Each structure stands twice: as structure tokens, then as C-alpha cells.
Amino acid sequence: NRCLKANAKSCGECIQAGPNCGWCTNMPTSARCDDLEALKKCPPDDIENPRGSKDIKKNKNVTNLKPEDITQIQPQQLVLRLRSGEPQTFTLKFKRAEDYPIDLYYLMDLSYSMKDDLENVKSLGTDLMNEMRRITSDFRIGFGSFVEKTVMPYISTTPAKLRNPCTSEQNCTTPFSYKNVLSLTNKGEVFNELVGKQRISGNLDSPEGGFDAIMQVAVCGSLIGWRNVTRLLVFSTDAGFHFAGDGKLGGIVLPNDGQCHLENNMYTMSHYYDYPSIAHLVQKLSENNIQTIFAVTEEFQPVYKELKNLIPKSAVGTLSANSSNVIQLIIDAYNSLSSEVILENGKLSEGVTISYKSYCKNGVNGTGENGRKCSNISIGDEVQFEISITSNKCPKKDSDSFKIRPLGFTEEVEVILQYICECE
Amino acid sequence: FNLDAEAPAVLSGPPGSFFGFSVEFYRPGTDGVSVLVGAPKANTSQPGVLQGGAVYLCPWGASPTQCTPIEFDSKGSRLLESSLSSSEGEEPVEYKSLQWFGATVRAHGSSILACAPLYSWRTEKEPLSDPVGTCYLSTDNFTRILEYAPCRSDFSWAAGQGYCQGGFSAEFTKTGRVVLGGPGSYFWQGQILSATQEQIAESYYPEYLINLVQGQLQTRQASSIYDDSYLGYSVAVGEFSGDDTEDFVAGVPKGNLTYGYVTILNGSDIRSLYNFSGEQMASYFGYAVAATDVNGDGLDDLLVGAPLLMDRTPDGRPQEVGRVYVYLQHPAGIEPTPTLTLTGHDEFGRFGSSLTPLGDLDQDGYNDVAIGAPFGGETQQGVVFVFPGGPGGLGSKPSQVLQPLWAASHTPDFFGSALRGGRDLDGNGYPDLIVGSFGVDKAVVYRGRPVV
Ligand SMILES: *[C@@H]1O[C@H](CO)[C@@H](O[C@@H]2O[C@H](CO)[C@@H](O[C@@H]3O[C@H](CO[C@H]4O[C@H](CO[C@H]5O[C@H](CO)[C@@H](O)[C@H](O)[C@@H]5O)[C@@H](O)[C@H](O[C@H]5O[C@H](CO)[C@@H](O)[C@H](O)[C@@H]5O)[C@@H]4O)[C@@H](O)[C@H](O[C@H]4O[C@H](CO)[C@@H](O)[C@H](O)[C@@H]4O)[C@@H]3O)[C@H](O)[C@H]2NC(C)=O)[C@H](O)[C@H]1NC(C)=O
Ligand SMILES: *[C@@H]1O[C@H](CO)[C@@H](O[C@@H]2O[C@H](CO)[C@@H](O[C@@H]3O[C@H](CO[C@H]4O[C@H](CO)[C@@H](O)[C@H](O[C@H]5O[C@H](CO)[C@@H](O)[C@H](O)[C@@H]5O)[C@@H]4O)[C@@H](O)[C@H](O[C@H]4O[C@H](CO)[C@@H](O)[C@H](O)[C@@H]4O)[C@@H]3O)[C@H](O)[C@H]2NC(C)=O)[C@H](O)[C@H]1NC(C)=O
Ligand SMILES: *[C@@H]1O[C@H](CO)[C@@H](O[C@@H]2O[C@H](CO)[C@@H](O[C@@H]3O[C@H](CO)[C@@H](O)[C@H](O[C@H]4O[C@H](CO)[C@@H](O)[C@H](O)[C@@H]4O)[C@@H]3O)[C@H](O)[C@H]2NC(C)=O)[C@H](O)[C@H]1NC(C)=O
Ligand SMILES: *[C@@H]1O[C@H](CO)[C@@H](O[C@@H]2O[C@H](CO)[C@@H](O[C@@H]3O[C@H](CO)[C@@H](O)[C@H](O)[C@@H]3O)[C@H](O)[C@H]2NC(C)=O)[C@H](O)[C@H]1NC(C)=O
Ligand SMILES: *[C@@H]1O[C@H](CO)[C@@H](O[C@@H]2O[C@H](CO)[C@@H](O)[C@H](O)[C@H]2NC(C)=O)[C@H](O)[C@H]1NC(C)=O
Ligand SMILES: *[C@@H]1O[C@H](CO)[C@@H](O[C@@H]2O[C@H](CO)[C@@H](O)[C@H](O)[C@H]2NC(C)=O)[C@H](O)[C@H]1NC(C)=O
Ligand SMILES: *[C@@H]1O[C@H](CO)[C@@H](O[C@@H]2O[C@H](CO)[C@@H](O)[C@H](O)[C@H]2NC(C)=O)[C@H](O)[C@H]1NC(C)=O
Ligand SMILES: *[C@@H]1O[C@H](CO)[C@@H](O)[C@H](O)[C@H]1NC(C)=O
Ligand SMILES: [Ca+2]
Ligand SMILES: [Ca+2]
Ligand SMILES: [Ca+2]
Ligand SMILES: [Ca+2]
Ligand SMILES: [Ca+2]
Ligand SMILES: [Ca+2]
Ligand SMILES: [Mg+2]
């Protein structure tokens, strides 16, 4: 065997030589490190054999009423003690909560082609509030608008086009990057009133500055008013999107820093930081548990369908030319997003690897990266994941920890890893 | 691996000038050898012009280098000749403030090309703010100075060439022909334009703003489905068509639903010869391009950078890292699939933001390449990777990693955001490498030396 062929000079070496290796303390010296059955073939007390284990610390039961006190993932914390090469497996239980609150921020393109949309969205407040009663008892809505970076070449910069980026007859307000019009509120009537006060704008190039705005909504936190609940971001537009690299045209080369720059509810730094990259958005949307609904016109479905494939917990729906259909669009996208859970883990150390197996309704079982997924999850449905973690020849000298969580949820599982590289 | 990384020469410009944004070798003869450094946010003495930008001439020699601005254009804006009457009084016909002159700097022989891609003008008709871009060309040891703004044409506004930003990228061919990229033409379809120096000089008249160069080569306007592609975001030159006339390599990073592609154009009639496609939406494939023989068979090979390329780590985490693609030319053509790829390892590092041929650094018969990752490194100051050529193309591992020896500041250095290699400054037989770090207004010159 390999315990012997390892020539374990010490106990530590013997343990790191394989999870089936024991070490006697009572014929070469390295023969003290043999298979556990071989060493017996040595008093069982004189055999040193530290095995791994899973020890649960926090294990609040899935619930069946503040958002803080509702549990959908279980357990919430545990310790894995890892013999090198020996995997430790624990089970994650996920139950979709019954009456979970929803925050929906409506982020809207206000370039001129969206003028007609704006006239239908100004009643969305109360209409969406009404429709949301078949989904949740606790709904809040907010509104933000975007156009473009306010620099050449994306906007015309004649004094006159700065005042009015559109034609003289059209009475467009000055171009702007992002305005938080209304932080989240349960008052649908306030949504209606403020949205009805907003003026349509304009700019020059077809793709728009919405990524600048998405970033702000994701990272600005208390300014937007996000709770620890379902966070829906509806991104509504009839055009493509600028992204990192496009800034260079306007002499903007500093990458987006992913931090809030809202003053008086206006994004003030669009002239200074580049548009975000897709990757940067993936990071900050996921970190901030934002589920994104791309509500866009048929012309741009192809673009946004590709974008959706890159942005975790996103959905695309086909917006009508004046947003007449956006409520159903939202409901249908929400149903898509909610019926699937996707697990992501934080970074592991070198030599540490993780494996997922999923066990979903109707006996559909996933492995590989499909092991992180369960689909077709109805309200009150329970699904489970078997997660396996394995360390190799002892990384670090202390313990590590990482989080596993379903994307779009505040809830998470803290996994603390302790590596067995010695004896006692 | 034989770049003197312990003792590089550091060039410094005005703080906040973005000195190092563009860099170049200048050699009329080896006697007057020098480094050129663009500083597109530099203040100049041009009347009425705020941050017009400058290009610095940095003499190379035994003594410590000191850089001085080159005077391509000492005047402010020309005037709308119809305005000097009227009633509103004088009105400028062009806008040189914030024009980023020096954003691109290139040299061939005793000729220097410097571009201001954010230069804009009014037109002489209805008032616009058309950022057509402009370039200045000094020829024959600074004796003659020409302006070349081929997008400053009779076709105005974004529908035409008004937003062209000609000179956004630029290169010289081996014959000294000027090649410009302008990514804004025809609702950001983008455009390549090219003229010989003789053609530019033959029709240069600062009296007229629209100086139609006859015989000019330029890509043609396409249908609206090609809008917002940014052809000419980057350009390089190399021979890919079997003759003795260098061809034009051009990035089209937002083409094909933002998957991007790179095109190679016939240097004789600017007709399309090859396209190479990106592999991921918005990876900015074609952010940078380069052409050089990296495997010693005498055929130019294509390199393309996609600095926003996102991959997944072994434990399932997406990360922005960037990637460079290499396509080897063969006698029958060039295959559309990359021969090899190099992927960055620093998250958000923007590996592949810049590329440069190094020539043969170690003199082993294979030309080598440098690739920048401007936000790479442990303190995100930026990094430059040297990769060796070889019979099957580039090595998979860097043979040298260059990093700024100075400490990080509160703002990014952008070390490696600009590169220029493959020329021998001191003439010791070994090629040398210029690296920009415009975030701290510096440029670094690495000397190649004998090493084993
Ligand atoms: C090249 O030269 C230019 C020109 O000198 C130089 O640009 C200046 O750079 C300094 C340093 O960063 C800037 O100083 C800051 O000014 C902030 C407020 O400035 C306001 O007031 C300016 C003066 O107004 C009077 O004078 C002008 C000119 O005669 C006149 O037109 C006015 O009517 C008025 O009489 C004004 O020029 C300036 O306008 C610019 O900026 C605003 C942005 O709001 C923009 O709207 C304008 O279009 C124009 O671009 C502005 O209105 C001041 O708050 C700030 O102080 C804060 O920041 C510093 C950090 O920098 C902190 O330390 C401090 O505690 C504060 O928090 C700072 O002092 C100056 O404004 C620039 N001027 C211009 C015109 O851009 C470049 O730096 C030079 N570049 C190089 C490479 O050398
Ligand atoms: C690499 O990838 C790029 C991008 O995909 C490829 O470039 C594209 O190639 C296609 C196919 O060649 C181009 O479409 C064609 O354009 C030609 C040329 O049009 C120009 O020249 C004509 C005279 O020669 C002129 O009449 C045209 O003027 C019209 O069109 C313009 C623009 O719409 C308009 O402004 C004018 O008012 C006129 O309306 C124009 O100046 C055109 O002739 C083609 O039409 C024929 O073929 C099509 C397809 O079969 C057919 O439907 C038509 O009926 C007609 O028979 C066609 O439109 C496209 O413009 C290129 N795009 C860009 C951005 O360059 C490239 O080919 C790839 N290279 C390789 C090696 O694969
Ligand atoms: C998402 O999950 C839902 C909930 O499970 C699921 O809906 C269910 O689909 C199954 C089919 O996959 C339905 O099962 C049928 O039920 C009827 C009685 O209502 C039976 O008569 C059927 O029996 C036939 O089919 C069997 C197939 O094994 C045969 O063995 C048998 O001999 C019969 O031929 C069958 O069992 C079930 O009724 C629904 N439930 C509801 C509430 O609608 C939905 O399909 C899933 N969607 C996916 C996976 O996309
Ligand atoms: C032009 O643009 C189209 C998009 O309209 C590009 O098509 C897309 O290509 C990518 C990469 O090849 C495809 O994604 C890949 O999917 C496979 C299979 O799932 C997977 O193994 C890869 O890792 C990658 O995710 C994508 O599906 C595809 N989209 C569509 C709508 O076809 C195309 O590649 C671009 N280039 C050319 C020359 O057409
Ligand atoms: C919503 O969830 C966030 C994240 O879990 C909470 O913020 C955390 O608060 C704890 C308090 O002990 C800190 O240790 C964490 O560092 C915080 N995390 C972040 C990212 O800030 C927040 O308190 C929750 N809000 C409510 C109302 O329960
Ligand atoms: C997916 O995995 C589950 C669990 O391993 C399988 O369901 C079990 O099937 C056995 C069959 O004898 C039953 O005795 C168990 O009671 C089932 N589990 C539960 C929790 O009820 C299922 O068969 C697997 N499906 C596939 C296709 O492999
Ligand atoms: C690049 O363009 C040149 C034209 O500038 C092509 O050369 C022409 O090819 C035709 C084909 O029969 C000849 O009739 C012309 O006399 C050629 N003209 C010149 C100036 O050589 C050349 O073939 C193109 N290269 C490729 C690879 O397509
Ligand atoms: C919005 O326009 C659509 C056509 O795109 C039309 O069918 C619908 O009636 C309009 N909405 C309202 C509220 O009038
Ligand atoms: Ca726009
Ligand atoms: Ca509309
Ligand atoms: Ca050729
Ligand atoms: Ca070659
Ligand atoms: Ca070499
Ligand atoms: Ca040298
Ligand atoms: Mg628009």
C-alpha cells in the first residue's frame, strides 16, 4: 500500500499520505505508517488516526414574520474537519418561502423613443401594486431613469443641444446619466405622481448608458432602500448598451470603481469612470442579491438574451413599443427567476475542491455544475443538495471559511474548514 | 527575459497630463534617436485652448533624458470666416480644447504623426460639435508640418463622418503611408482611412478646413445593421495578402452583436480579406491588435486582445481577466480559429489591453511579444508580460514579467496601458521596449542586453 510506500517519517506525514493511513507509536520505522487494518494485523489505542467530521453550529429550521426571521436555507453554519484526500459531505435544504417580500426597482431608459412608454408607466405604480397581491403581501416599488454619459461623443455638446438634446419642437430635458427618482416605497400612488412629473430626454448614439445606472442601483444600498428580501431590478429600454471600453472614445479610461456616487439622487461621476464591464456587473449584482429583468423591445431581444446568459439570476422579456405589457412581462420573468435556485460558493483555498449534487422535485438529479441547480421549484417546495468538500496535502496553517448561497438571497451557509495535518 | 528590469529609464511629464498615454520610437538616423511620448491632457500655449494636449520629444543618450514639447500647432482655433462680420462677433470654426492631441503618436523615418481624436469642429454651415478628429504630420526633420483630418469632410454629423474621431488609432506602413482608424463614422460603424504622405502634402491648405486628399483610401459606409461596431478602435499593419504592400489590421470590437471581430483589409484597395471573431459578448475582442511573425517562417501573424474576457475559476467563480488570441499565417491563408490563446490571471487586470511586437529579444530566431495588463499585479498598478516566439508560436508562459518599481498611489498607474517595442535605441543589437504609465505621468524604457 501507499502508507508504507510513503515512508512516513512522522505522524503528520502518515496522515497526509492518505485517509486510510494510521500511525503506531509503540522492521523499519516507516512501517509504523501502514493501513489501519495492517497495523492491527498494534494496540487500537496506540494507533493515531484523526478522521474528519461535520459539526453543525447553526441549524435553524426551514420555516412553515420579519424577513430576518424567515429561513429558506438550512443549515446556516457548520464546521468541516478534513483529513487530506477524504471528502466531507453535508446536505443543504432549500424551501421556497410562501409569502416572501419583494422590492422592485424600475430602472427606465428616458431617451426620446421612450416618451410614449413614460406615459404608460406613470400608472404602473398602482397597477403593479394591484397585480402583486397575487404574489406577495409585502411589495415595494421604486423608480430611476437613465440616458447617457454627459460628454462628447455620446451627446451633442452645442450649448443648444445641451439644453435640449432633441429637436426644437420636442421639449426634451437635458441629457443625464442616472436619476434616482424614487427610492423603494409601498406607496404606489407616489410612484405614479413622481413618474408623471419626469421629463423625457435625448442623446446622440443609439446604445445607452444604463450600465452606469445598473451599477449605482446595485451598490448604493440605503439610498435605494433595498431590504433583505427578493430584489428585482427591471431594466427597461429599446436600445443596446454601452460597456467598458466605450469610455475611451470620450477620453474616459478609469474603470468603474463599483462604488456609490449619488449626490442629490444623481449619478455625478459618469464623466470620470468608464461604463462597467459585464463581468463587473455580474460581480456587483450577485454580491448585492439583485435579480435583473431585462424588459426590452423585440429588436433587441438577441442582444439581451446573450447578456442574460452571462448575468446570473436574470431574465429577458419582450417589452411592447410603449411598455403596455410590462406588468405581465414582470410577472412572467419573476415566475421564471423564482422557480429555479442556483448555488454559488465563495473562493476556496488552493488544494481545496468542491462538488455539488442536486436532488430536485420529480426525481431530476443534477451533477457537475448542474449539481448547483434545481429547476421548477414551486412555492413551499423542498429540494436538497449534497455538497462535498475535499482538501489536499494540507493548505494553510489555520482554518478557513467560505459561504455558499443561493443567488438573489441574503440567506447563506457558512462553511468553516479545519484541516487535519497533525495528530494528538 | 533579457530586458534590464532592475534599472529602467523613467521619463516624467507634467502631472495630470497623461504623459505616457502613447509612446513611440523616433529615428531619422540613429544619431538623433529619441522617445516620443503623448500627453493628451497637457496644457499648451495655444491661445484660447484648454488642455489641447502635447507630444514630448525625449532625446536618448548617455546623460539623463529631459523631454520637451514638439510644436506641431502653436495657434488656437481658426475662425468662422462668415462670423467676423454678423453681429455676434468672432466665432471659432473649430474646438481644440480637450482635443486629446497626443492620444496617438507614431513615427516613420523623420516623419511623426500625432492625433487629437477628440478634436471637433463647427462646420462652416449649420453649427455642430462634430468630433471628426485631426492629426498633425511633421515631415523631414520638423521642417514641414501638415494637418490631416480626412473625416473633416463634406459629410457631417453622426450620420456622416462627423463623429469619426479619425486618429483614435493610427499606424504607419513600412513605406510611410498613414493609416487611421476612426470608430465613429456612419453612426459608429467606424472607418479606416489611408493616404500617402505625398498625397497629404499635395493638397494641404490651412485656409480650407475640408482638405479632400485625392487618391485617399477609405472603407465605405454600410447599412444600419452595422451601426455601433467601432471599426478602427484599433489598427496595425502587416502583410497578409501575398504581395509587397502592407495590409491593414483593424479591430471591430462591438461588431456582430458585441461579440466583436477583427478585420484585415487589402492595403492596395482597402477591400476586406479576412475576419476573425471574438468568442464572448462584450469581451472587447479587438481592443488591441498587432501583427508580427512570431514563429520564424517569414509570414506575419495576427494577435488580438480581448481585455474584458470573462472565464470561470475551478471553484465556479466568474472573473474578468482578459485574453489574447494568436492566428498564424500559412501560405494558403490564415485559419479563423486561433492557433493559441493566452489568458490573464489577475481579476480586472485587463490582460490584452495593449500588444507590441518586441522583435527578437533574445536573438534565438523567433520574434517575441509584450502584452499589457494595466490593472494587473498585487497592487493593481499594472503589469507587462513578455512572451517568447517559437516554431509553433508563442510560449504559454511569460519569459519576463515587468512591473513598476515605484509604490502604488491613491489612483491607478495604468502601467502597461501603452507599449512600443522592436526597435534598438542604443544600437547594441538588442531590441528595446517603451512602456507607458500615464496614470502617474511616466514612461519607462527597458533596454535589451546580452543575457543567458
Ligand atoms: C490645465 O489648466 C487648467 C486651467 O487652469 C486646469 O484646470 C483647473 O484645474 C484645477 C485643479 O484641479 C481646478 O481647480 C478646482 O476648481 C474647483 C471649482 O472650480 C470652479 O471655478 C473655476 C474658476 O471659476 C472662475 O474662473 C473661471 C476662469 O477664469 C471663469 O470662467 C469663471 O466664470 C469664474 O470666474 C472654474 O474654472 C471651474 O470650471 C470648470 O470646472 C467645472 C466643474 O464644476 C465645469 O463645469 C466647467 O465647465 C470648467 O470645466 C469651476 O466652475 C474647486 O472646487 C476644486 O476644489 C475642490 O477640489 C480640490 C481637488 O482638486 C480639493 O482639494 C478642494 O478641497 C475642493 O474639494 C479645485 O480647486 C480648476 O477648476 C480647473 N479649471 C478648469 C477650467 O478646468 C488643469 O488642471 C490643467 N491641467 C494640467 C495637466 O496642468
Ligand atoms: C467581414 O465582415 C464584414 C462585416 O460583416 C463584411 O463586410 C460586409 O460585407 C457585406 C457583403 O459584401 C456588405 O454588404 C454589401 O455591400 C455592398 C457594397 O455596397 C457599397 O458599394 C456599392 C457599389 O459597389 C454601392 O451601390 C452601395 O451603396 C448602397 O448601399 C449603401 C449602404 O447601404 C447606401 O449608403 C447607398 O445609398 C446604397 O444604398 C455601397 O456604397 C453591396 O453592393 C451589397 O449589396 C449586394 O449584395 C447583397 C448581398 O448579396 C444583396 O442583397 C444586394 O441586393 C446587392 O446585390 C451588400 O449590401 C457590408 O456593407 C459589409 N459591411 C461592412 C461594415 O463593411 C466583410 O465582407 C467580411 N469580410 C470577409 C472576408 O468575410
Ligand atoms: C414541474 O413540476 C410539476 C409538478 O410535479 C409538473 O407537473 C406534473 O407533471 C407530471 C408529469 O411529469 C404530472 O403527472 C401526471 O399526473 C396524472 C394525474 O394528474 C397522471 O395520470 C399521469 O400518469 C401518466 O404518466 C405517468 C408518467 O410516469 C405514467 O407512468 C402513467 O402510466 C400515466 O401514463 C402523470 O403521473 C402531474 O400531474 C403534474 N402535476 C401538476 C400539479 O400539474 C411539471 O410537469 C413540471 N414541469 C417541468 C418538469 O417542466
Ligand atoms: C457572432 O455573434 C453570434 C451571436 O449572435 C455568436 O454566436 C454565439 O457564439 C457563442 C460562442 O461560440 C455561443 O456560446 C457558446 O455556447 C456553447 C454551447 O452552449 C458553449 O460551449 C460555449 O462555452 C459558449 O457559451 C452562443 O451560443 C452563440 N449564440 C448564438 C445566438 O448563436 C457568434 O459566435 C459570433 N461569431 C460568428 C462568426 O458568428
Ligand atoms: C441585511 O443583511 C445584511 C448582510 O447580511 C446585514 O448586514 C450585516 O450585518 C452584520 C451584523 O452583525 C455584519 O456583521 C455584516 O458585516 C453585515 N454585512 C454587510 C454586507 O454589511 C444587515 O444588517 C441586514 N439587515 C437587516 C435589517 O437585517
Ligand atoms: C434522484 O435521487 C433521489 C434520492 O437519491 C432518488 O429518490 C429515491 O429513490 C429511492 C428508490 O428506491 C427511494 O427509495 C427513495 O425514497 C427516494 N428518495 C426520496 C428522498 O424519497 C431518485 O430515484 C433519483 N432519481 C434518478 C433519476 O436517479
Ligand atoms: C488586393 O488588391 C489588389 C488591387 O489593388 C488586387 O490586385 C489586382 O488583381 C486583379 C485580379 O485579376 C488584377 O486584374 C489587377 O491588375 C490587380 N491590381 C494590382 C494593382 O495588383 C489584389 O489581387 C488584391 N489581393 C487579394 C489577396 O485579393
Ligand atoms: C401602447 O401601444 C400599443 C401598441 O404597441 C397599444 O396596443 C396599446 O393599446 C398602447 N397602450 C395604451 C395603454 O394605450
Ligand atoms: Ca447613447
Ligand atoms: Ca416607445
Ligand atoms: Ca498585402
Ligand atoms: Ca508566422
Ligand atoms: Ca525570441
Ligand atoms: Ca538596444
Ligand atoms: Mg435611445
> What CATH number corresponds to the domain at position B323?
2.130.10.130
**Do A146 and A289 have their domain in common?**
yes
Instruction: Annotate A146-169 with DSSP letters as a single string.
Output: E---SSTTTS--SHHHHH-SS-SS
**Do A273 and A218 have their domain in common?**
yes
Distance B295 CA to ligand 12 centre (A): 5
Helix (H, G, I), strand (E, B) or coil at B351: coil
B26 touches chain A (CB under 8 A): no
Helix (H, G, I), strand (E, B) or coil at B84: coil
| Ion ligand 11 residue ranges (Cβ < 5 Å) | B 241, 243, 245, 247, 267
B217 lines ligand 7 (CB under 6 A): no
Query: Residue B88 to residues B48, B81, B124, B130, B209: CA-CA distances in angstroms?
Result: 18, 13, 15, 21, 22
Q: Residue A294, Cβ neighbours under 10 Å: how many? A: 27
Query: Residue B427 to residues A198, A407, B1, B293, B430: CA-CA distances in angstroms?
Result: 66, 59, 18, 22, 7
Q: For chain B, first and last CA: distance in Å? A: 9
Q: Any binding-site annotation on A238?
A: no
Report yes or no: B211 and B284 within 8 Å, Cβ to Cβ: no
- As given in the structure block, the three cell numbers for residue A85 are 484526500
State whether the Cα torsion A76-A79-A82-A86 is positive or negative: negative
Inter-chain CB pairs, A–B, below 8 Å: 114
Identify the CATH number of the domain in which residue A409 sits: 2.60.40.1510
Rounded CA-CA distance A379/A369 in Å is: 24
Encode B211-247 in three state secondary structure: CCCCCCEECCCCCHHHCCCCECCCEEEECCCCCCCCE
Query: Residue B148 to residues A122, B86, B141, B243: CA-CA distances in angstroms?
Result: 51, 30, 18, 28
Chain B positions touching A278 (Cβ under 8 A) are 281-282, 308, 310
Element (H, E) at A303: helix A301-310
Among candidate residues A308, A338, A368, the one where a domain is terminated? A338
Q: Any binding-site annotation on A236?
A: no
Method: X-ray
Rounded CA-CA distance B431/B421 in Å is: 7
Ligand 8, pocket-test mutation among A322, A325, A326, most atoms within 8 A of CB? A322
Among candidate residues A338, A365, A397, the one where a domain is terminated? A338
Query: Residue B401 to residues B3, B4, B364, B416: CA-CA distances in angstroms?
Result: 10, 11, 19, 11
Work out how many domains chain A is built from and give that number: 3
Strand pairing class (A230-237; A290-296): parallel
Report yes or no: A48 and A23 within 8 Å, Cβ to Cβ: yes
A179 CB-side CA count, 13 A = 18
Q: Residue A287, Cβ neighbours under 10 Å: how many? A: 11
**Do A280 and A373 have their domain in common?**
no
Report yes or no: A60 and A76 within 8 Å, Cβ to Cβ: yes
**Do A279 and A417 have their domain in common?**
no
B389 CB-side CA count, 13 A = 29
Cβ-based neighbours of A306, under 8 Å, separated by 6 or more: B257, B258, B281
List of E strands, B117-243 = 120-121, 134-139, 144-148, 169-172, 178-182, 191-195, 217-218, 235-238
Q: Considering every ligand atom, which ligand is closest to the CA of B244?
A: 11
Considering CB atoms only, which of A157, A277, A345 is closest to B315? A345
Rounded CA-CA distance B137/B166 in Å is: 14
**Do A236 and A359 have their domain in common?**
no
State whether the Cα torsion B225-B229-B235-B241 is positive or negative: negative
Rounded CA-CA distance B92/A193 in Å is: 45
Instruction: Respond yes or no on whether the N-terminal peptide bond of residue A43 is cis (omega within 30° of 0).
Output: no
The interface residues of chain A toward chain B in range 102-161, judged by CB-CB distance below 8 A, are 152-153, 156-158, 160-161
Q: Residue B78, Cβ neighbours under 10 Å: how many? A: 15
Could you tell me which of B321, B319, B315, B292 has the C-alpha nearest to residue B304? B292
Distance of CA A166 to the CA centre of its chain: 38
Rounded CA-CA distance A64/A216 in Å is: 36
Identify the CATH number of the domain in which residue A29 sits: 3.30.1680.10
- As given in the structure block, the three cell numbers for residue B259 are 461579440
Report yes or no: A81 and A52 within 8 Å, Cβ to Cβ: yes
**Do A292 and A255 have their domain in common?**
yes
**Do A226 and A312 have their domain in common?**
yes
**Do A212 and A134 have their domain in common?**
yes
Work out how many domains chain B is built from and give that number: 1
Distance A378 CA to ligand 6 centre (A): 19
Distance of CA B374 to the CA centre of its chain: 15
**Do A222 and A370 have their domain in common?**
no
State whether the Cα torsion A367-A369-A373-A375 is positive or negative: negative
Distance B241 CA to ligand 12 centre (A): 13
The interface residues of chain B toward chain A in range 432-451, judged by CB-CB distance below 8 A, are none
Q: What angle do CA A312, A315, A316 make, to 5 degrees?
A: 135
Among candidate residues A33, A48, A63, the one where a domain is terminated? A48
Rounded CA-CA distance B196/B214 in Å is: 10
List of E strands, B317-417 = 318-320, 323-327, 329-330, 333-334, 340-343, 354-359, 368-373, 383-387, 400-402
Angle at which helices A326-338 and A124-132 cross, to 10°: 40
Question: Across the interface, do A253 and B417 touch by the CB < 8 Å criterion?
Answer: yes
Q: Can you give the residue range of the structural domain that contains B68? A: 1-452
Rounded CA-CA distance A126/A327 in Å is: 11
Q: Can you give the residue range of the structural domain that contains A156? A: 99-338
Q: How far is B27 from chain A (nearest CA, A)?
A: 29
- As given in the structure block, the three cell numbers for residue B424 are 534598438
Chain B positions touching A354 (Cβ under 8 A) are 315-316
Question: Across the interface, do B257 and A303 touch by the CB < 8 Å criterion?
Answer: yes
Q: Considering every ligand atom, which ligand is closest to the CA of A118?
A: 10
Resolution rounded to one decimal, in angstroms:
1.9
Burial of A266 (0-12, 13-18, 19+ CB in 10 A): middle
B320 touches chain A (CB under 8 A): yes
Report yes or no: A260 and A220 within 8 Å, Cβ to Cβ: yes
Report yes or no: B444 and B11 within 8 Å, Cβ to Cβ: yes
Q: What angle do CA B363, B419, B170 make, to 5 degrees?
A: 115
Rounded CA-CA distance A231/A313 in Å is: 11
